[PDB]
Amino acid sequence: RDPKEWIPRPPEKYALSGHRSPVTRVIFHPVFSVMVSASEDATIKVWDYETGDFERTLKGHTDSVQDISFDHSGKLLASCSADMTIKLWDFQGFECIRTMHGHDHNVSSVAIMPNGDHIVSASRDKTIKMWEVQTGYCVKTFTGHREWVRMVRPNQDGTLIASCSNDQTVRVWVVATKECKAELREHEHVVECISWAPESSYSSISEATPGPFLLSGSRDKTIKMWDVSTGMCLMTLVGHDNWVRGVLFHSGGKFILSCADDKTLRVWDYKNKRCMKTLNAHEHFVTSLDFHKTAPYVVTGSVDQTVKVWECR
Amino acid sequence: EQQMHLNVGLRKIKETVDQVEELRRDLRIKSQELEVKNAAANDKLEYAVLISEAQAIKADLAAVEAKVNRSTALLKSLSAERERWEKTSETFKNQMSTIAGDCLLSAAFIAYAGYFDQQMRQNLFTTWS
């Protein structure tokens, strides 16, 4: 079968355990068959998800890490933590390259735009900072957020940077022009997670309710979707019974896999605007989820010190 | 790994302050509500029911107060760590910046000056410094 329809099935393919803390974020490697997990014990763990084998542990951050981000080459790894530091890791060398200072609070997010030159950083200090990767200097600064900027993601072309914050706003900016192109204020609660829409979804969203489009999930048990060019909420998924912690598109651009704090991993289609399958993944709060582009595997990182890998079928 | 122990240890001692600060305001809330029940018992002077009820409040007030004074010594004993754990937390930015200076002086002393005498090792270290 094609990668288009892939929905995970119970039970888990693997139940990786060995973290001494809640798991905050899990992502796949773009080319290799290995995955990297981030947890609150300041240990960035590397696990082979095909065989369920623990590979390695990178310990450079002296406080709990929040978000980890690869690059599309898979060589550089950007990691953010609450020690006022960001760390750049050589993935082929498995050692740190540089450490970034300048944030005055918990660095709640980190990302790399597809141009392969800089680093985004959203933090608790109501600002976003731009970091030069090769030199190691803080260049630019998005300012205008009024609360805890939760998590940040750049667009697939590298010209739009969107960030959710605790002030019930989704703010989409251009990278160099430093203006808020879209200050979306429709969510009732803190928006905790966004997900940039892929190209194949750009048609599928447009016939559900061109581009660019953006997802967001908040603590009001709702997942809203927005047109960036117009600036309004087109569609909203309700059916979670707690805080939506991570919202994620399908790689083919039809389904949306989203995890929420009510022990639910629910798949949603905007054609029917409902939840077709709900999965009871863990025994506690589920923080983050990730789905591979070419492989039929969904990894799920949760508070219960276990990371669960589920085969998509 | 020395700062991994400091950051977790200084986080939990602020929770112990928070556990004390939860107990302190709840102590005086139950203390002032005890005297209202003590004044309401004399208003009725059901009287035997309120006597056993107010004795349960005072015993629970003792359990709160004994928890407070146990924690107050625990606040007092662990604070002497905090008047040096926080100082080594400030020193972490200082002592990370001088690793490259100190490891240059240390690796030069440990791979080069192993043959020479004390005066010559001191002269080499003075020249490198």
Short mmCIF file of N, CA, C and O in Angstrom, two decimals, chain A residues 82-200:
data_model
loop_
_atom_site.label_atom_id
_atom_site.label_comp_id
_atom_site.label_asym_id
_atom_site.label_seq_id
_atom_site.Cartn_x
_atom_site.Cartn_y
_atom_site.Cartn_z
N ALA A 82 16.32 24.69 29.34
CA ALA A 82 16.00 25.75 30.28
C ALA A 82 17.22 26.28 31.03
O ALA A 82 17.07 26.80 32.15
N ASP A 83 18.41 26.15 30.46
CA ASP A 83 19.63 26.59 31.12
C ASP A 83 20.18 27.88 30.52
O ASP A 83 21.35 28.21 30.77
N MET A 84 19.35 28.60 29.75
CA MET A 84 19.67 29.73 28.87
C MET A 84 20.58 29.34 27.71
O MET A 84 21.18 30.22 27.09
N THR A 85 20.70 28.05 27.40
CA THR A 85 21.62 27.58 26.37
C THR A 85 20.88 26.84 25.27
O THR A 85 19.86 26.17 25.50
N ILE A 86 21.40 26.97 24.05
CA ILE A 86 21.02 26.14 22.92
C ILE A 86 22.27 25.36 22.51
O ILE A 86 23.38 25.86 22.60
N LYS A 87 22.08 24.12 22.07
CA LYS A 87 23.25 23.32 21.72
C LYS A 87 23.12 22.79 20.31
O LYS A 87 22.06 22.29 19.91
N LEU A 88 24.22 22.91 19.56
CA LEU A 88 24.32 22.36 18.21
C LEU A 88 25.17 21.10 18.26
O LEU A 88 26.31 21.14 18.73
N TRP A 89 24.62 20.00 17.77
CA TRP A 89 25.24 18.69 17.85
C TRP A 89 25.58 18.20 16.46
O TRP A 89 24.73 18.21 15.57
N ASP A 90 26.83 17.78 16.27
CA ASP A 90 27.21 17.04 15.08
C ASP A 90 26.64 15.64 15.21
O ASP A 90 27.06 14.88 16.09
N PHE A 91 25.67 15.29 14.36
CA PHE A 91 25.03 13.99 14.48
C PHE A 91 25.96 12.86 14.04
O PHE A 91 25.89 11.76 14.59
N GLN A 92 26.81 13.11 13.05
CA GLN A 92 27.76 12.08 12.64
C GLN A 92 28.91 11.95 13.63
O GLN A 92 29.53 10.88 13.70
N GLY A 93 29.21 13.00 14.38
CA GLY A 93 30.29 12.95 15.35
C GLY A 93 29.83 12.66 16.77
O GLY A 93 30.65 12.27 17.61
N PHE A 94 28.53 12.84 17.02
CA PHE A 94 27.89 12.62 18.33
C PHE A 94 28.55 13.45 19.44
O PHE A 94 28.72 12.98 20.57
N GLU A 95 28.91 14.68 19.11
CA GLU A 95 29.44 15.63 20.08
C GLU A 95 28.90 17.02 19.76
O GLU A 95 28.46 17.29 18.64
N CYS A 96 28.93 17.89 20.77
CA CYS A 96 28.44 19.24 20.59
C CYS A 96 29.41 20.06 19.74
O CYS A 96 30.61 19.77 19.67
N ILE A 97 28.87 21.09 19.09
CA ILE A 97 29.65 21.98 18.24
C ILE A 97 29.70 23.38 18.82
O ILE A 97 30.78 23.98 18.94
N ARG A 98 28.56 23.93 19.22
CA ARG A 98 28.53 25.24 19.85
C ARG A 98 27.35 25.33 20.81
O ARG A 98 26.37 24.57 20.71
N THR A 99 27.46 26.27 21.74
CA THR A 99 26.46 26.53 22.76
C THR A 99 26.08 28.00 22.70
O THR A 99 26.95 28.87 22.66
N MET A 100 24.78 28.27 22.69
CA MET A 100 24.22 29.59 22.44
C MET A 100 23.64 30.16 23.73
O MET A 100 22.90 29.47 24.44
N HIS A 101 23.99 31.41 24.03
CA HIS A 101 23.47 32.12 25.19
C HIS A 101 22.94 33.47 24.74
O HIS A 101 23.36 34.01 23.72
N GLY A 102 22.01 34.01 25.53
CA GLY A 102 21.36 35.25 25.17
C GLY A 102 19.90 35.28 25.55
O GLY A 102 19.32 36.35 25.75
N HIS A 103 19.29 34.11 25.67
CA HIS A 103 17.94 34.02 26.21
C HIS A 103 18.00 34.13 27.73
O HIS A 103 18.93 33.62 28.37
N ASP A 104 17.03 34.83 28.31
CA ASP A 104 16.99 35.04 29.75
C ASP A 104 15.99 34.14 30.46
O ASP A 104 15.73 34.34 31.65
N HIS A 105 15.43 33.15 29.76
CA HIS A 105 14.43 32.28 30.35
C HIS A 105 14.49 30.92 29.66
O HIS A 105 15.43 30.63 28.92
N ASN A 106 13.47 30.10 29.90
CA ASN A 106 13.39 28.77 29.31
C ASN A 106 13.21 28.85 27.81
O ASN A 106 12.21 29.38 27.32
N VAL A 107 14.17 28.30 27.07
CA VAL A 107 14.08 28.23 25.62
C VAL A 107 13.13 27.11 25.26
O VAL A 107 13.51 25.93 25.26
N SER A 108 11.88 27.46 24.97
CA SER A 108 10.82 26.47 24.83
C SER A 108 10.76 25.83 23.45
O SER A 108 10.03 24.85 23.28
N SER A 109 11.49 26.35 22.46
CA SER A 109 11.47 25.75 21.13
C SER A 109 12.77 26.07 20.40
O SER A 109 13.46 27.04 20.72
N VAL A 110 13.07 25.24 19.40
CA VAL A 110 14.19 25.45 18.50
C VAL A 110 13.85 24.78 17.18
O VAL A 110 13.16 23.75 17.15
N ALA A 111 14.29 25.39 16.07
CA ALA A 111 13.99 24.87 14.74
C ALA A 111 15.03 25.39 13.76
O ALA A 111 15.72 26.38 14.03
N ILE A 112 15.12 24.72 12.62
CA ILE A 112 16.01 25.11 11.53
C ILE A 112 15.17 25.25 10.27
O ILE A 112 14.48 24.30 9.87
N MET A 113 15.21 26.43 9.65
CA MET A 113 14.49 26.64 8.40
C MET A 113 15.24 25.93 7.27
O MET A 113 16.45 25.70 7.37
N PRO A 114 14.54 25.55 6.17
CA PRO A 114 15.19 24.75 5.12
C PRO A 114 16.31 25.40 4.31
O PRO A 114 16.81 24.76 3.38
N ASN A 115 16.74 26.63 4.62
CA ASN A 115 17.89 27.17 3.92
C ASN A 115 19.21 26.66 4.47
O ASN A 115 20.25 26.88 3.84
N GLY A 116 19.20 25.98 5.61
CA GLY A 116 20.39 25.40 6.19
C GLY A 116 21.43 26.39 6.68
O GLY A 116 22.63 26.12 6.56
N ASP A 117 21.00 27.53 7.21
CA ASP A 117 21.94 28.56 7.65
C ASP A 117 21.68 29.11 9.04
O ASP A 117 22.64 29.57 9.68
N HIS A 118 20.45 29.08 9.55
CA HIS A 118 20.13 29.75 10.80
C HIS A 118 19.32 28.83 11.70
O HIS A 118 19.06 27.66 11.37
N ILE A 119 18.93 29.37 12.85
CA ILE A 119 18.19 28.63 13.87
C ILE A 119 17.14 29.57 14.47
O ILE A 119 17.45 30.72 14.82
N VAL A 120 15.89 29.09 14.57
CA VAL A 120 14.82 29.81 15.25
C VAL A 120 14.87 29.43 16.72
O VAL A 120 15.26 28.31 17.07
N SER A 121 14.48 30.35 17.61
CA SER A 121 14.35 30.01 19.02
C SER A 121 13.22 30.80 19.65
O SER A 121 13.31 32.02 19.78
N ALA A 122 12.17 30.09 20.06
CA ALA A 122 11.11 30.67 20.87
C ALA A 122 11.33 30.31 22.33
O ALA A 122 11.73 29.18 22.64
N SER A 123 11.08 31.26 23.22
CA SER A 123 11.39 31.08 24.63
C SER A 123 10.30 31.71 25.49
O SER A 123 9.33 32.29 24.99
N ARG A 124 10.48 31.59 26.81
CA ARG A 124 9.54 32.10 27.80
C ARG A 124 9.60 33.61 27.95
O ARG A 124 8.66 34.19 28.52
N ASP A 125 10.64 34.27 27.45
CA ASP A 125 10.84 35.70 27.67
C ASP A 125 10.11 36.57 26.65
O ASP A 125 10.54 37.71 26.42
N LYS A 126 9.03 36.05 26.05
CA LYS A 126 8.13 36.78 25.15
C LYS A 126 8.84 37.35 23.92
O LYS A 126 8.53 38.45 23.46
N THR A 127 9.81 36.60 23.39
CA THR A 127 10.53 37.01 22.20
C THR A 127 11.06 35.78 21.47
O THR A 127 11.16 34.69 22.04
N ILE A 128 11.39 35.97 20.19
CA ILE A 128 11.97 34.93 19.35
C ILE A 128 13.33 35.44 18.88
O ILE A 128 13.46 36.62 18.53
N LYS A 129 14.34 34.58 18.90
CA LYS A 129 15.68 34.97 18.49
C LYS A 129 16.17 34.13 17.32
O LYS A 129 15.84 32.94 17.20
N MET A 130 16.94 34.78 16.44
CA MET A 130 17.53 34.18 15.25
C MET A 130 19.01 33.95 15.51
O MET A 130 19.70 34.86 15.98
N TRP A 131 19.49 32.76 15.19
CA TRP A 131 20.86 32.39 15.53
C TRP A 131 21.62 31.96 14.28
O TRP A 131 21.12 31.13 13.51
N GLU A 132 22.81 32.51 14.10
CA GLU A 132 23.69 32.12 13.01
C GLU A 132 24.43 30.84 13.38
O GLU A 132 25.05 30.76 14.45
N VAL A 133 24.38 29.85 12.49
CA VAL A 133 24.80 28.50 12.86
C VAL A 133 26.32 28.36 12.80
O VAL A 133 26.96 27.91 13.76
N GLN A 134 26.92 28.75 11.67
CA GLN A 134 28.35 28.53 11.48
C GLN A 134 29.21 29.47 12.31
O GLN A 134 30.22 29.05 12.89
N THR A 135 28.84 30.75 12.38
CA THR A 135 29.63 31.69 13.18
C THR A 135 29.32 31.54 14.67
O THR A 135 30.23 31.36 15.48
N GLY A 136 28.04 31.61 15.03
CA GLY A 136 27.66 31.42 16.41
C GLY A 136 27.25 32.69 17.12
O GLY A 136 27.57 32.88 18.30
N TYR A 137 26.55 33.58 16.42
CA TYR A 137 26.17 34.88 16.95
C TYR A 137 24.68 35.10 16.76
O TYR A 137 24.09 34.67 15.76
N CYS A 138 24.06 35.77 17.73
CA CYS A 138 22.63 36.06 17.72
C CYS A 138 22.40 37.30 16.87
O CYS A 138 22.85 38.39 17.21
N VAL A 139 21.68 37.14 15.76
CA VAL A 139 21.56 38.18 14.75
C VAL A 139 20.28 38.99 14.93
O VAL A 139 20.32 40.19 15.17
N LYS A 140 19.13 38.34 14.79
CA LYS A 140 17.85 39.03 14.68
C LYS A 140 16.91 38.62 15.81
O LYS A 140 17.15 37.64 16.52
N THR A 141 15.83 39.38 15.97
CA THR A 141 14.94 39.19 17.11
C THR A 141 13.52 39.60 16.74
O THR A 141 13.27 40.77 16.44
N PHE A 142 12.61 38.63 16.74
CA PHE A 142 11.18 38.92 16.65
C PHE A 142 10.66 39.32 18.02
O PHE A 142 10.84 38.60 19.00
N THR A 143 10.00 40.48 18.08
CA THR A 143 9.45 41.00 19.32
C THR A 143 8.01 41.42 19.08
O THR A 143 7.66 41.92 18.01
N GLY A 144 7.17 41.20 20.09
CA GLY A 144 5.76 41.55 19.98
C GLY A 144 4.85 40.60 20.72
O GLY A 144 3.70 40.94 21.01
N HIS A 145 5.34 39.40 21.03
CA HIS A 145 4.57 38.47 21.85
C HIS A 145 4.48 38.99 23.28
O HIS A 145 5.42 39.60 23.80
N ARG A 146 3.34 38.74 23.92
CA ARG A 146 3.08 39.26 25.25
C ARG A 146 3.05 38.20 26.33
O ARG A 146 2.90 38.53 27.51
N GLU A 147 3.18 36.92 25.97
CA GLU A 147 3.15 35.84 26.95
C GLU A 147 4.19 34.79 26.56
O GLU A 147 5.07 35.04 25.73
N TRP A 148 4.09 33.61 27.17
CA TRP A 148 5.01 32.51 26.93
C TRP A 148 4.83 32.00 25.51
O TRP A 148 3.81 31.38 25.18
N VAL A 149 5.83 32.24 24.66
CA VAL A 149 5.86 31.68 23.32
C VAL A 149 6.13 30.19 23.45
O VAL A 149 7.22 29.78 23.86
N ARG A 150 5.14 29.37 23.10
CA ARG A 150 5.22 27.94 23.37
C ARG A 150 6.17 27.23 22.41
O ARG A 150 7.19 26.68 22.83
N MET A 151 5.85 27.24 21.12
CA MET A 151 6.63 26.46 20.17
C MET A 151 6.55 27.13 18.80
O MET A 151 5.53 27.71 18.44
N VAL A 152 7.64 27.03 18.05
CA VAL A 152 7.82 27.75 16.80
C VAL A 152 8.20 26.77 15.69
O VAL A 152 8.83 25.74 15.94
N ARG A 153 7.75 27.07 14.47
CA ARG A 153 8.03 26.25 13.30
C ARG A 153 8.12 27.14 12.07
O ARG A 153 7.26 28.01 11.89
N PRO A 154 9.14 26.96 11.23
CA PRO A 154 9.19 27.69 9.96
C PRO A 154 8.48 26.94 8.84
O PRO A 154 8.27 25.73 8.90
N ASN A 155 8.12 27.70 7.81
CA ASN A 155 7.45 27.12 6.66
C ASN A 155 8.43 26.31 5.82
O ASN A 155 9.65 26.40 5.97
N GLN A 156 7.88 25.50 4.91
CA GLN A 156 8.68 24.58 4.12
C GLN A 156 9.58 25.28 3.11
O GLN A 156 10.60 24.72 2.71
N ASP A 157 9.22 26.49 2.68
CA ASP A 157 10.08 27.24 1.77
C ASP A 157 11.11 28.08 2.50
O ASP A 157 12.09 28.52 1.87
N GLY A 158 10.94 28.31 3.80
CA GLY A 158 11.88 29.10 4.56
C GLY A 158 11.64 30.59 4.55
O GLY A 158 12.55 31.36 4.88
N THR A 159 10.44 31.04 4.17
CA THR A 159 10.12 32.46 4.13
C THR A 159 9.08 32.88 5.15
O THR A 159 8.85 34.08 5.31
N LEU A 160 8.44 31.93 5.84
CA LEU A 160 7.43 32.24 6.84
C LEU A 160 7.78 31.53 8.14
O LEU A 160 8.10 30.34 8.12
N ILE A 161 7.72 32.25 9.25
CA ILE A 161 7.97 31.70 10.57
C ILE A 161 6.73 31.93 11.42
O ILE A 161 6.34 33.08 11.65
N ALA A 162 6.11 30.85 11.87
CA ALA A 162 4.88 30.93 12.65
C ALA A 162 5.14 30.45 14.07
O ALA A 162 5.85 29.46 14.28
N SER A 163 4.55 31.15 15.04
CA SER A 163 4.76 30.84 16.44
C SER A 163 3.44 30.95 17.20
O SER A 163 2.68 31.90 17.00
N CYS A 164 3.20 29.99 18.08
CA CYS A 164 2.08 30.05 19.00
C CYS A 164 2.58 30.51 20.37
O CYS A 164 3.72 30.24 20.75
N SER A 165 1.72 31.22 21.10
CA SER A 165 2.10 31.74 22.40
C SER A 165 0.99 31.44 23.40
O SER A 165 -0.04 30.84 23.07
N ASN A 166 1.22 31.88 24.64
CA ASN A 166 0.26 31.68 25.72
C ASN A 166 -0.83 32.74 25.75
O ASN A 166 -1.77 32.62 26.55
N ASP A 167 -0.74 33.78 24.91
CA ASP A 167 -1.74 34.84 24.90
C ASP A 167 -2.84 34.61 23.87
O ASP A 167 -3.40 35.58 23.35
N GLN A 168 -3.13 33.33 23.56
CA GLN A 168 -4.21 32.90 22.67
C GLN A 168 -4.08 33.49 21.27
O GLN A 168 -5.07 33.81 20.61
N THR A 169 -2.84 33.63 20.81
CA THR A 169 -2.54 34.17 19.49
C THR A 169 -1.68 33.19 18.72
O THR A 169 -0.85 32.48 19.29
N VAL A 170 -1.88 33.16 17.40
CA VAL A 170 -0.98 32.48 16.48
C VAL A 170 -0.40 33.55 15.58
O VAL A 170 -1.13 34.18 14.81
N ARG A 171 0.90 33.79 15.69
CA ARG A 171 1.54 34.91 15.01
C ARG A 171 2.44 34.38 13.91
O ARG A 171 3.42 33.68 14.18
N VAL A 172 2.10 34.71 12.67
CA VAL A 172 2.88 34.34 11.50
C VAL A 172 3.62 35.58 11.02
O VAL A 172 3.01 36.63 10.80
N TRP A 173 4.94 35.44 10.86
CA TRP A 173 5.85 36.52 10.53
C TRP A 173 6.62 36.14 9.28
O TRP A 173 6.70 34.97 8.90
N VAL A 174 7.21 37.14 8.64
CA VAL A 174 8.19 36.92 7.59
C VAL A 174 9.56 36.97 8.26
O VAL A 174 9.73 37.61 9.31
N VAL A 175 10.54 36.27 7.67
CA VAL A 175 11.80 35.97 8.36
C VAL A 175 12.62 37.23 8.59
O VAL A 175 13.10 37.49 9.70
N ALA A 176 12.79 38.05 7.56
CA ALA A 176 13.65 39.23 7.67
C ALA A 176 12.88 40.52 7.89
O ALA A 176 13.43 41.46 8.48
N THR A 177 11.63 40.60 7.45
CA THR A 177 10.87 41.84 7.49
C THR A 177 10.35 42.19 8.88
O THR A 177 9.89 43.32 9.07
N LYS A 178 10.38 41.24 9.82
CA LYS A 178 10.14 41.45 11.25
C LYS A 178 8.73 41.94 11.57
O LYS A 178 8.50 42.50 12.65
N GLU A 179 7.77 41.76 10.66
CA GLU A 179 6.40 42.14 10.92
C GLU A 179 5.56 40.90 11.16
O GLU A 179 5.85 39.82 10.64
N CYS A 180 4.51 41.06 11.97
CA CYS A 180 3.55 39.99 12.20
C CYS A 180 2.54 40.03 11.06
O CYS A 180 1.66 40.89 11.02
N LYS A 181 2.69 39.10 10.11
CA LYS A 181 1.80 39.06 8.96
C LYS A 181 0.39 38.64 9.37
O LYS A 181 -0.60 39.13 8.81
N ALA A 182 0.28 37.75 10.35
CA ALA A 182 -1.03 37.27 10.79
C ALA A 182 -1.03 37.09 12.29
O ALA A 182 -0.33 36.22 12.81
N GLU A 183 -1.82 37.90 12.99
CA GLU A 183 -2.04 37.75 14.43
C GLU A 183 -3.43 37.14 14.61
O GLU A 183 -4.42 37.85 14.81
N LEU A 184 -3.50 35.81 14.53
CA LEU A 184 -4.76 35.10 14.60
C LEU A 184 -5.21 34.97 16.05
O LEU A 184 -4.51 34.35 16.86
N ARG A 185 -6.35 35.57 16.37
CA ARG A 185 -6.94 35.54 17.71
C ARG A 185 -8.34 34.96 17.60
O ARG A 185 -9.33 35.69 17.50
N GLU A 186 -8.43 33.63 17.63
CA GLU A 186 -9.72 32.94 17.72
C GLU A 186 -9.75 31.84 18.77
O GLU A 186 -10.84 31.43 19.17
N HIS A 187 -8.60 31.34 19.22
CA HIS A 187 -8.57 30.28 20.21
C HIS A 187 -8.95 30.81 21.59
O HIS A 187 -8.64 31.94 21.95
N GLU A 188 -9.63 29.96 22.35
CA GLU A 188 -10.07 30.31 23.69
C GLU A 188 -8.99 30.13 24.75
O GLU A 188 -9.06 30.78 25.80
N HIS A 189 -8.00 29.28 24.50
CA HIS A 189 -6.97 28.98 25.49
C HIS A 189 -5.57 29.14 24.93
O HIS A 189 -5.38 29.66 23.83
N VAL A 190 -4.58 28.67 25.69
CA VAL A 190 -3.18 28.71 25.27
C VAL A 190 -2.99 27.73 24.12
O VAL A 190 -3.30 26.54 24.25
N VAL A 191 -2.48 28.23 23.00
CA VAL A 191 -2.17 27.38 21.86
C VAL A 191 -0.80 26.77 22.10
O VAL A 191 0.20 27.49 22.20
N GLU A 192 -0.74 25.44 22.19
CA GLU A 192 0.48 24.77 22.60
C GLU A 192 1.29 24.21 21.45
O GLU A 192 2.48 23.93 21.64
N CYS A 193 0.70 24.05 20.27
CA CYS A 193 1.37 23.34 19.19
C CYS A 193 0.78 23.76 17.85
O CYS A 193 -0.44 23.85 17.71
N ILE A 194 1.66 24.00 16.88
CA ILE A 194 1.26 24.26 15.50
C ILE A 194 1.91 23.20 14.62
O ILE A 194 2.81 22.47 15.03
N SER A 195 1.43 23.13 13.38
CA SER A 195 2.00 22.23 12.38
C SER A 195 1.80 22.85 11.01
O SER A 195 0.66 23.11 10.61
N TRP A 196 2.90 23.09 10.30
CA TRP A 196 2.81 23.69 8.98
C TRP A 196 2.24 22.70 7.98
O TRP A 196 2.57 21.51 8.00
N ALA A 197 1.36 23.18 7.12
CA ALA A 197 0.68 22.32 6.16
C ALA A 197 1.62 21.97 5.01
O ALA A 197 2.31 22.85 4.49
N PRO A 198 1.68 20.71 4.59
CA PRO A 198 2.48 20.35 3.42
C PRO A 198 1.81 20.80 2.13
O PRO A 198 0.68 21.30 2.11
N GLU A 199 2.54 20.61 1.02
CA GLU A 199 2.05 21.06 -0.28
C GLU A 199 0.86 20.24 -0.76
O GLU A 199 -0.11 20.79 -1.29
N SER A 200 0.90 18.91 -0.55
CA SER A 200 -0.18 18.04 -0.99
C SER A 200 -1.47 18.29 -0.22
O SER A 200 -2.56 18.03 -0.75
#
